[PDB]
Amino acid sequence: ALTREQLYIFDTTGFLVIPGVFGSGEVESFRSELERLDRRYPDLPAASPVFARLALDDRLLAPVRDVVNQPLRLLEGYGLRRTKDSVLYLHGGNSELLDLGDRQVGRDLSITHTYHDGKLYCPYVKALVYLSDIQSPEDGSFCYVQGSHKANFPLLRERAERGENTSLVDSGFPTLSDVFVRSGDVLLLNEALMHGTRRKLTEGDRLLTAFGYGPTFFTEWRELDAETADLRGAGYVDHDVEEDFV
Amino acid sequence: PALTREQLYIFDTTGFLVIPGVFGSGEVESFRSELERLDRTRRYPDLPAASPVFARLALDDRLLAPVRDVVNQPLRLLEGYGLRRTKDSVLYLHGGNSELLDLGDRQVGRDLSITHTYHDGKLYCPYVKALVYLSDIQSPEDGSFCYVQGSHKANFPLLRERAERGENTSLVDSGFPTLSDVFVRSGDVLLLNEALMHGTRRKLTEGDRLLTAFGYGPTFFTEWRELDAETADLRGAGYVDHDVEEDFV
Amino acid sequence: ALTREQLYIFDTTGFLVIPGVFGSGEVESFRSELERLDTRRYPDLPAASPVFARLALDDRLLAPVRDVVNQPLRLLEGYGLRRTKDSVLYLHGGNSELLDLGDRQVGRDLSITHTYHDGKLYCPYVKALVYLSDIQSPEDGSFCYVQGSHKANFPLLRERAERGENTSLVDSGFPTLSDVFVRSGDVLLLNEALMHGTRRKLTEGDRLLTAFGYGPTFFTEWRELDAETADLRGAGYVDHDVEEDFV
Amino acid sequence: PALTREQLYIFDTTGFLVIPGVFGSGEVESFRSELERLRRYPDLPAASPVFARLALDDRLLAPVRDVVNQPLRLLEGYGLRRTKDSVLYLHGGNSELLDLGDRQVGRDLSITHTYHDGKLYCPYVKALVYLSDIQSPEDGSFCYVQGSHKANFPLLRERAERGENTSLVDSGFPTLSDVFVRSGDVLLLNEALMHGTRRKLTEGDRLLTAFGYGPTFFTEWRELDAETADLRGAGYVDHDVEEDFV
Ligand SMILES: [Fe+2]
Ligand SMILES: [Fe+2]
Ligand SMILES: [Fe+2]
Ligand SMILES: [Fe+2]
């Protein structure tokens, strides 16, 4: 369970780094199972018994429950290997626009979060379990826009419209910031946060596993391009992201 | 077929909207006829998958234009059913923005399936319902739709304290200061934000109460399915409801 | 102090009628004090009379007001109101009504912008109406209000004014406009974000009441102000769209 | 002189805004010189025509109007001179508690802000005009708790009850950041933000002027201890601040 200083930090920043959650032994168990699984590794829980158990470990479920406060369902669980020269352009943000064909909307209810009577209510959160140190920007560090999880104005739509071609992750931004982590730390993430990763320059592999959680009525995570015509299309339609003009 | 400023004001401030005379007499009759084809007090589950008639109605623009104006998300059809009500049927109160749920280790007072917001000129309601009325309902004994005023934006819970004080009567049978009724004509559509606390009066008159209902929400909501509590393996999908009158009446 | 059911009702409807807070004895006592001071408005009652100065601090008023403001408190206004036949009060208030502010148009009035947090309501401006006579039909000039309008997100009145209307909704009617009936010595606790008014009084006699407004200690005492002054030194409350603006 | 979309984003997401080089070095010498004619310098406009003009200068009013969006009133205007070993402990914060006699409240309406149809509505903002350079924490830099202008949990009360003695501007806090400014820069501040300054360890005076603005129905700024028995007390009652227990 999260302390009050942790809930406070989560609420105000949109994420929480929890240091030293998993032992060196466990991390190596996790690392081994990833190397055997040979870019992204979809559905880790169906492919391993150790990842099916990780997805329900109390070291992940207890902080998750404290920020979702709904009946839970496991929405996704993947592995991630990043090599030299990989990058993750910004996505998320609370007020980014989306065109529907007859209107543009400014809310994505899959990430719209609230607070009520001592409890945070976030619909979609991730637990990033790092399996390798990342201690400098060139290691491909997590980066985020400060406060962007409670943002009221869109940011990217005007960038794209004025013909930008450079991701903030490369060029910088007054409120872009990095997070540095050690093996077996967990990064608890509010998906409303606008975030990405620095371009990795270093040699070696960066590895992590990620589990996404939500209310029991959210469909399992899968990308959808748009509402289908028979209104039967399920999935998550993305709003403005840097990959749409960078 | 879109909603006026005044219609949006009313949906926003009351949690619902009667759109009158949407379907003509002929359509209403073909609808009832189709229900008669599918055949006391009884239910017609999953209408869109059992009838091409009702599969068309689900995607009719007279239902979709209003819905799109209050959901404003990539849309999905979550549910669709038929209802035939006779004498001595009642629907007790359910819904309400702030009703409590015991999760086991805690107590929560939000339900994110009905938690709605507003931003830059648009309403964002994640679960709305289109009721298509195939019968006139013109008095409370006909089993009229009833609701608690403003309950779609209530910050306090109502039902827990009544359950605890040992009440066993529904406000539907008993009355409440801000409990109001809604009267409709057949062919009227009632647009409904599911955050509203609502039910219907006990029906004591003769004849058949007939309606169809369709639920819409975002494409990342699952098709409607009742779920008692979170499944033991966090795989189960569905909707866990909060305090409803059925729980202690 | 308000009950959970009373807090629920106030939060969900924007007001609360608390029945029979003052007995017939106090009521006539209050009524007589209004005479001694002789639509007519009796401004600054607490300065004009020790009786109303006492009323304004009466725990029967302050306990329910504290339950809806929940700030360090300040008396912001106190007046009396005498109404007679053919008097009417058109709609004012409304959470999202517009105000033209020189170079922009705004749709929030922070003097009535209210919130909820951790079990408590926080309304910055509430009125306690003490009724000194019964009102049991619309033609008596009953309190009327637009349901849910204290938490409205769209403006109502501007569309009407631009569409060129000139009849008030208290006369013409409106789908969600309702009336409230009260008895002598009732208190009506009102959230000023609520859009309200009164029906036109067609009956004979006098409709008497006293109103005390309350707010945080950093609100100025109530005063109308046409607009921001050029030296930024003018204090007071600038009205958003009201029906009197075009009826 | 109105705020760009990016400046509005930053102010919304962080709770403040540094506006660089608003006043030239001639103007800044004019202000420093005037402050020599007259440590806190209370009510500057009433005391000096130069600062009466500055209080209504459009380089301040234009951005202020963009984040308040109400009929505007000037609520305070003071000057500030700090020397060595001066410090300013944390205060502000969206959810800091206040004991009200028979109850405990967690909103302060004088700084409770909102957003509606494209506009920010912040009832109390300060415009800080810096007359000297602050480029290191030991000059006594402005500091703030990130995202605390939208915080939903209290932070200080629990610290106070645990019995903490030292301030966060001394020990540090994981989300406490610093802001460096140059002479002639304007800091535009949402007062819901929890903020203060580092202890000044250098010589030379630290000069700035501050003007505070709100809606016309706000009383001019004065400190008030509690609501008075006659409910006639006007002014601003502060919630938990660090000075209460440090
Ligand atoms: Fe991501
Ligand atoms: Fe229902
Ligand atoms: Fe009024
Ligand atoms: Fe300050």
Output the domain CATH number for residue D50.
Answer: 2.60.120.620
Chain A contact for D155 (CB, 8 A cutoff): yes
**CA gap D243, D224 in Å, rounded:** 16
Domain of C199, in residue numbers:
1-247
Instruction: Looking at the CA of B95, name the nearest ligand.
Output: 2
Which burial class, exposed, middle or buried, applies to A135 when counting CB atoms under 10 A from its CB (0-12, 13-18, 19+)?
A: exposed
**What residues are paired with B123 via a beta bridge?**
B118
The pairing of strands A72-82 and D104-105 is: unpaired
The ligand with the least distance to the CA atom of D221 is 4
Is residue D58 packed enough to be buried (19+ CB in 10 Å), middle (13-18) or exposed (0-12)?
Answer: exposed
Report the alpha-carbon distance of residue B199 to residue C39 in Å, rounded: 43
State whether the Cα torsion C14-C19-C25-C28 is positive or negative: positive
| Integer Cα distance of D122 and D110 in angstroms | 9
What residues 197-226 of chain A have any CB closer than 8 A to a CB of chain B? 213, 215-219, 224, 226
Amino acid letter, residue D100? L
**A94 touches A149 (CB < 8 A):** yes
The CA-atom distances, in angstroms, between D120 and each of A21, A175, B123, C66 are 40, 19, 19, 28
How many Cβ atoms are within 10 Å of A133's Cβ, its own excluded?
Answer: 15
Cα distance between residue D157 and residue D99, in whole Å = 11
Ligand 3 center from residue C90 Cα (angstroms): 10
Best of A116, A119, A121, A152 to disrupt the C interface (most C CBs within 10 Å) is: A116
Residues present in chain A in total: 246
CB contact (8 A) between residue C113 and residue D121: yes
Tokens read off for D31: 């202000």
Rg (chain A; Cα; Å): 18
| Annotated binding residue A124 | no
Q: From the candidates C154, C165, C178, C194, which should be mutated to test the interface with B, based on the most B CB atoms within 10 A?
A: C154
Which residues, 6+ apart, have CB-to-CB distance to D10 below 8 Å?
Answer: A174, A175, D17
Ligand 3 center to C211 CA (angstroms)? 9
Q: C touches which chains (3+ CB pairs under 8 A)?
A: A, B, D
Overall domain count for chain C? 1
Name which of D196, D72, A59, D9 is nearest C233 in CA terms: D72
Sign, CA dihedral A216-A217-A218-A219, equals positive
Nearest by CB to C108, from D114, D233, D235: name it.
D114
Q: Is the dihedral of CA B197, B198, B201, B203 positive or negative?
A: negative
- Cα gap C11→D190, rounded to integer Å: 28
Q: What are phi and psi of D85, to 5 degrees?
A: 65, 20
From the list D76, C200, B235, the residue with the least C-alpha distance to A72 is B235
Structural contact between residues C239 and C92, judged by C-beta atoms closer than 8 angstroms: yes
Which chain A positions have a beta carbon within 8 Å of D12's beta carbon? Answer: 147, 151-153
SS (H, E, C) chain B: CCCCHHHHHHHHHHCEEEECCCCCHHHHHHHHHHHHHHCCCEEECCHHHHCHHHHHHHCCHHHHHHHHHHHCCCEEEEEEEEEEECCCCCEEEECCCCCCEECCCCEECCCCCCCCEEECCEEECCCEEEEEECCCECCHHHCCEEEECCHHHCCCCCHHHHHHCCCCCCHHHHCCCCEEEECECCCCEEEEECCCCEEECCCCCCCCEEEEEEEEEECCECCCCECCCCCCCCCCCCECCCCCHHHCC
Q: How far apart are CA B65 and CA A246, in angstroms?
A: 35
Measured CA to CA in angstroms, residue B217 lies from A96, A217, B18, B196 at distances of 20, 11, 19, 16
Rg (CA), chain D: 18
Indicate the Cα dihedral angle D235, D113, D171, D139, nearest 10°. Answer: -80
| A117/B106 Cα distance (integer angstroms) | 12
- Contact residues for B177 (Cβ-Cβ < 8 A; gap 6+): C9
In chain D, which ranges are continuous DSSP H helix?
Answer: 5-14, 25-37, 44-47, 49-55, 58-68, 156-162, 168-171
- Taking contacts as CB-CB distances below 8 angstroms, the residues of chain D near C67 are none
Q: How was this structure determined?
A: X-ray
* Residue A57, Cβ density class (10 Å: 0-12 exposed, 13-18 middle, ≥19 buried): middle
Q: Give alpha helix (H) positions in D141-200.
A: 156-162, 168-171
Does any CB of chain B come closer than 8 Å to the CB of residue C195? no
- Ligand closest to B195 (CA) is 2
> Does the CB of B39 have a partner CB in chain D at under 8 Å?
no
Return the sign of the alpha-carbon dihedral for residues C27, C32, C35, C37.
negative
Residue B20: CB atoms within 10 A of its CB come to 11
Picking from B13, B154, B155, the nearest residue to C176 by CB comes out as B13
How far is Cα A167 from Cα D202, in angstroms, rounded to an integer?
Answer: 40
Record the tokens describing residue A43, joined without a space.
Answer: 């559905």
Task: Answer whether C35's CB lies under 8 Å from C211's CB.
Answer: no
Structure tokens of D231? 């409910």
Containing A53, the helix (H) or strand (E) segment is: helix A49-54
In whole angstroms, how far apart are CA A129 and each of A214, B25, B90, B201? 17, 61, 51, 53
* The residue type at B87: K
D175 touches chain A (CB under 8 A): yes
8 A C-beta contact, residue D214 and residue D123: yes
| DSSP states along A212-223 | EEEETTBPPP-B
Helices and strands in chain A: count of H runs, count of E runs? 7, 14
Query: 């005379």: which residue's tokens?
Result: B21
The C-alpha atoms of residue C173 and residue C180 are separated, in whole angstroms, by 15
Q: Look up residue B122 and give its amino acid.
A: K
Contact A206, A139 (CB under 8 A): yes
